[PDB]
Subunit: 582 residues, 3 copies
């Protein structure tokens, strides 16, 4: 509940309950220095639904303008659709909460958090995640927590926790870390990391560039704060310790109950690894399609009408066996090694009559990036509880239905599009030129012509290429890449008895299936000198520093390779387009 950062004063987080929203299943009011107020209320449905196929969890943040003491500027004088920052905060709170419930739950859960009072010099995302975690812990649901989040910024080589807006502009790197306590040592679920806007000028004058070692040190520094916050959530003045409640059982719907495993694993486990050794896309299935058909045919003698259960058992068995094959043989599905990158192609000036256009292809990902320019008056004007009003860089991300082959309805973007666009924009901001040198309004649009998985950083590279082609002077090109990590308790029979120990394997250019098979995923973006944007999320209970460092160096090597590949086409700013405005 208390944070001492050293010479920058102290911060206090307070958690109150029992006074507001008594009718809800759980409700917690969060105080930041008795100056910021917010309220989190979580309720659960009574009768679960059965037609749905996943866990129906909903999050709703509500920014209210009366906190800022200003009537809304809308024509009808009312706050309507959620803002982009609200959607980003909703995603940030939802991400470390879904992998914390009992699998297969069916009762609907809704978490509503509303801003009550906001200091103009502070932000509310971390307070929001803390209050939501405390409320859902007090709710009484099968929730495996509590979770704790901390925001830490690097200034003058020091990692100060919970910085304000007046302290972040003079920082070189910012962390938002969400983790829990397993046995006393923290276990991080997620982290979101961004470099500030003026990092280049700061590091030029003597400051330390945000390299990978600094990132690891920053991730290490945030653990005591998370531990203190979790302890406060557990045993504050009004916490779960003083408000013990009975736990009500919730019905759980599993994919396979008890028996389909004891059949399939004993009848359909010949090799289940040699069928995937063909290595040809046109001959991918080639053996195990017949295996699946024969299994679903000949097993239709004891379990009738339960094809979903047999499908779930088959897919789970295949996933486990390919995981074991990955761990032992170090042989990927596509035949690539653990440090291989798929085929690359970069084309410049593909769309005519445009200020800048480029096409970037990696494996199956294929992204077309277009950039335009106009008068400086065209900058976006926004107003919310946040301290941001102007936005000279407008990045839009489009994921049409025909990218993945399915059919749907083209229309309003989802939250995933907002998240990916925000991530790419925040990765590309720090290298932008100054307004005085280059006064213009830059609108970059990235359309997903073809997708297979992890296509955001392909869009990042394509946007860099298009910005360079348009003639915009960038300080240095910025690349991106995605990496995965599989950790498992493997058994070696060299001793008696079989010794079980944890082993880690890091993979490059993970597809959707690769992400499904793995347990940790992360994405690294940056330039030749330092990283800019980082996003990590997993469900492990600990990780040695050596393997994390090695994965970071592998990511750096892959990013350098991608940068060198992309620099072959165009490495210098191009001539201004005749249609561009002066």
């Amino acid at each position: 509940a208390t944070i001492d950062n050293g010479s920058f004063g102290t911060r206090t987080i307070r958690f109150e309950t029992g006074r507001l929203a008594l009718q809800a299943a759980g409700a917690v009011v969060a105080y930041l220095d008795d100056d910021n107020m917010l309220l989190s209320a979580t309720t659960a449905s009574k009768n679960p639904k059965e037609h749905f196929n996943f866990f129906p969890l909903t999050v709703d943040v509500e920014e209210r303008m009366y906190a800022a003491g200003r009537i809304p500027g809308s024509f009808f004088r009312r706050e309507g659709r959620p803002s982009t920052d609200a959607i980003l905060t909703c995603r940030l709170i939802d991400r470390p909460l879904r992998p914390s419930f009992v699998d297969g739950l069916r009762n609907e859960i809704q978490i509503v958090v509303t801003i009550l009072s906001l200091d103009p010099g502070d932000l509310y995302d971390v307070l929001a995640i803390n209050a939501a975690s405390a409320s859902t812990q007090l709710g009484g649901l099968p929730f495996s927590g509590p979770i704790g989040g901390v925001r830490v910024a690097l200034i003058d080589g020091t990692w100060v926790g919970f910085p304000t807006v007046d302290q972040i502009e003079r920082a070189v790197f910012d962390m938002v870390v969400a983790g829990r306590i397993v046995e006393g040592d923290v276990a991080i679920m997620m982290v979101e990391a961004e470099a500030t806007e003026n990092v280049v000028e700061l590091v030029e004058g003597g400051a330390q560039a945000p390299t990978e070692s600094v990132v690891a040190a920053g991730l290490e520094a945030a653990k005591p704060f998370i531990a203190a916050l979790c302890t406060a959530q557990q045993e504050l003045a009004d916490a779960a310790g003083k408000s013990g409640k009975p736990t009500v059982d919730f019905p759980v719907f599993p994919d396979y109950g008890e028996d389909v495993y004891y059949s399939v694993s004993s009848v359909a486990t010949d090799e289940l690894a040699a069928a995937l050794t063909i290595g040809g896309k046109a001959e991918r299935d080639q053996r195990i399609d017949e295996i699946k058909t024969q299994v679903v045919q000949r097993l239709a003698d004891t379990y009738e009408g339960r094809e979903k259960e047999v499908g779930a058992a088959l897919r789970a068995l295949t996933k486990k066996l390919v995981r074991q094959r990955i761990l032992t043989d170090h042989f990927r599905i596509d035949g690539r090694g653990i440090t291989d990158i798929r085929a690359l192609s970069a084309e410049v000036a593909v769309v005519p009559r445009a200020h800048g256009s480029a096409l970037f292809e990696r494996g199956e990902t294929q992204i077309l990036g277009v950039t335009t320019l106009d008068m400086i008056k065209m900058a976006q004007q926004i107003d919310s509880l946040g301290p941001e009003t102007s936005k000279r860089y407008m990045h839009h991300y489009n994921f049409p239905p025909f990218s993945t082959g399915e059919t749907g309805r083209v229309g309003s973007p989802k939250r995933r599009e907002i998240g990916h666009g925000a991530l790419a924009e925040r990765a590309l901001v720090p290298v932008l030129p100054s307004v005085e040198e280059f006064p213009y309004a830059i609108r970059q649009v990235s359309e997903a012509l073809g997708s297979n998985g992890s296509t955001s950083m392909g869009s990042v590279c394509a946007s860099t290429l298009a910005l360079l082609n348009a003639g915009v002077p960038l300080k240095a090109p910025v690349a991106g890449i995605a990496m995965g990590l599989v950790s498992d308790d493997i058994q070696v029979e060299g001793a008696v008895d079989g010794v079980v120990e944890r082993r880690f394997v890091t993979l490059t250019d993970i597809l959707g299936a690769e992400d499904a098979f793995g347990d940790m995923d992360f994405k690294v973006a940056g330039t030749k000198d330092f990283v800019t944007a980082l996003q990590l999320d997993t469900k492990l209970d600990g990780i040695p520093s050596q393997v994390l460092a090695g994965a970071l160096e592998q990511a750096k090597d892959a990013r350098l390779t991608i940068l060198e590949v992309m620099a072959e086409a165009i490495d210098r700013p191009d001539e201004m387009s005749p249609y561009a405005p002066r």
Copy 2:
């Protein structure tokens, strides 16, 4: 069809049909003085649906800008979403129409009324309800009407019917009354009453304040107009008399057909009143949960798969028996008396960094009110067929899903929120300070932290508290309260044979269950001197003046008690907030 108010000329309402919209089931064109034109068309579906659980009735008013001779100001030059006044009129017409059809109907009904020509000095809500009632009467549906609505304003001690905008600003009280004819004497279903903006200055100079006796006199004065309008609807030039049509039977889906009553009322009617005498919230059920389980278990021998029917029979039997217990023992479910008010709590300056903030709790209702101020330029700009353009007082009402414990989707407000917010704003307007003395833009927001039933006037009191805390000088604090009334034909055995006669009981602070058990509900809001906002709606066929007057005095006493309770915390305007703007 004709209204003679005395020295203020006469008004004429005309109902025409047979010329427009022949394809519809019913269609009526309404003329107001041959200067206002509107059209009402009602149609019914053919095959009723079965998955729905209530009566699917829809109302749609359509304000068209070409009546005002002005191109819409929208960017796309088209009238899109309905306006707030349209939603209010939709609610006003829908309210006295739902309790007029055969219960359990399943065929969808849609009533669409569109404005065709509007005089800038007149309103259209009462003409709308009249035209819709006439059209649905001509449709041929199982509709028990017709209904009639009248607008009556009090000026110079006289109740003039159908006032214009140039006559309402000099009034002290306004009535909209909707009623029908049962045996010759009118039977009012609904009434909506509001005090004007400049009532204080008018009553200060010699006019009569709108007290409860004046309200009763005004409600009494509107009956002849309703009778004349109903007679015109019945027997005008083009009415139901000259346009007789066959009545087509519509399938009716009941909760219990014929037999579940003869079982449950004979096997599960031991006391059904002693089980609710526990009086503890944690021990509320405590006897009748087991009764319900045993009834639904042991009766699963003749009716299988009809648990909905047995549930409906059980709930109806319990409602009837608790109604009888209320009538005879005068003992409420919670143990409170017929003139009791639940626990009260008022807190001021609860939300920091705000111009004004307050919290008000009554029983289970818990409302947080916040008020902010800004420049006078921030006044809301609107434009419609109505004569209103500016709105210095902006009241918003929020009902989040977690107030009542359920889960839903937070998003666009429904019509109930619009109605409650409009009611609270109209109740709080007349006491506002003048623009010259207090030039500011006032935006009040009321969020329902906790709800149990009838939480709008809790929001009214909370908004009054927040406005006082912000430093806004109000003429007098304004309170609100809700009351219920149960009337039933009780039998006394003191004579031979058993004498059946009507008895009335008035209850204070009605919950949802109390509203379900009763037959009449009303809500009274106002200050220590006079009332401001009134809303009444019921389904009775008559009421003596004495019981209505007594209920009004009981409401006045409860409102005075609430005002005295709330005045203990803060009774004077507070200091201006340092974050507030100076203008």
Copy 3:
């Protein structure tokens, strides 16, 4: 792929594939003179749905502002809802594509076409339809094409193909023709025709007015271009010839499989034409309702639970027999002749307190038109990839649910409303007065009080009446009308054996049932001198010029009759309303 219009240079259309959007079922990039770029991608669902009752086909055009090199003017700086021109183009591409698939298909089909680069002096609708047709041909679906579209404008008596914006303002008539190849000669499915804004001044100085013969000549002139475009689609550098793909079978759900016909046609075919000879609206059914009830009752012995199949068989049999009766007896259902017009009524100044108001009734169609005026500042401001920015004439079309008797939800307009409103506005534009003479903002609204079928041109006439009543000086009143055509292979037994030959019958004032029974429908609008708006759509494989010409003259006669009927009420501009605003 190449268009030579004579002295106006040449145009080139290029179709590329295999480079973009590989994951889709089909994808084609379209080049217009290497200056306009667009992309069409079509994909199909895997498992078809069964609860739906029609073919689920969706079209989506996407105008992207980065083609014009301009940040969107929206508050959130993003292109949101589709524009009116986008909806019109969506309808224009969807219309000649639905009657080209195997009937009863259930797999969902989605066609998404996005603008990539647009020349400010060119349009994209015809390139859009061409690219979509090529993509759906390359997709591998059961698609009976390919289709070709051509835009042809008449300037100086010459029909130049693919005109630009700098060439259309000096034209007298514009055609968009979509047709295919059956045996070598083209077969037109659809055509959309409009007269330019300044046609009156042009034809006054010596140019030829766009009469019916000129329309027929223009429809004849566009065929070689369609043939060349279809040949290019078939055998270009990257076309279906070099990209042969297997055809995957798609399940087909029919209304009646094989047997219900052999029962109903043998047991319930006594006359099926005498039951409809009553001629009274209140006694319409009067015989065949009992026939339907007895058929559905006594046949419930072999097919149980298949009432939908028996209903489909009954309705199909009735349609075929009434078609034969129409062909042979020349006797319509309502008893009217082949050149009859239903009852007409026109009323002026019906809605009080309005600049102009009128009511027009024809048969069962009943339309109330209202027109208002305001300051010239009130002109609509729009911005898109198109070259249009201002719109002084704003026509709105409303179709409330209670017009046809059903119940629904009143709200956002559908695409049909947009299409009908755009058609009426484009028909009424060329006769509008000049801005300098009549500086005002004109907003006309047409509400469908009662509808039976083909009620758009009733709205056109009502809007003309209301504009005349408001005092707006029009050059000449404009009327509209709808006509149908039924062509069938009838057999005459005067020779041995029975000689089968094609016969055509043209009908006036077609209702919904008449449109269902027929095979060709068209709508003609215009003034006493020339036509303005034309819209034709059918599914024939050829038509002689003589019958088309005769149908055109019949339409002209009906339009003249309607004009003479409507001119009886008011024929001159009326006095300005006291509520109207004055600009002086």
